[PDB]
Design a binder for this molecule. Structure first.
Ligand code: NAG
Ligand code: NAG
Lengths: 48, 52
């Protein structure tokens, strides 16, 4: 008549908060460029 | 239920009989070595010291 029931599951460890890694889906590489342009001792810093 | 009293029951064999020194006054951290009380209720929490 005795019976025993056991159960098991899992969760992220407490230290996970800083040891976690992430999977990323990337696409559509886009470029941003910073330029310095000088014309007739007229300097300009631009980014585009 | 017997308080400060020795008591008897019909079935003379004292083996199958079961007794508790139960107090049900303190909360404890879940551990495999300890049977689960029928309440199986989450009553409180605690933090873990010395975080990262
Ligand atoms: C740039 O050069 C011109 C002459 O070529 C001069 O008149 C002007 O003062 C100069 N500007 C600076 C900021 O040096
Ligand atoms: C056992 O508990 C009951 C209910 O609280 C109480 O009336 C009785 O006096 C207690 N007996 C003890 C502590 O010996």
């Amino acid at each position: 008549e005795n019976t025993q029931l056991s159960e098991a599951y899992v969760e992220f460890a407490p230290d996970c908060t800083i040891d976690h890694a992430v999977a990323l889906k990337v696409h559509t590489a886009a470029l941003k460029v910073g330029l310095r342009i000088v014309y007739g001792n007229t300097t300009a810093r631009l980014d585009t | 239920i017997v308080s400060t009293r020795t008591k008897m029951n019909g079935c003379t064999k004292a083996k199958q009989c079961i007794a508790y020194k139960r107090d049900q006054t303190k909360w404890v951290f879940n551990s495999p070595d300890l049977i689960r009380h029928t309440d199986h209720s989450v009553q409180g929490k605690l933090h873990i010291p010395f975080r990262l």
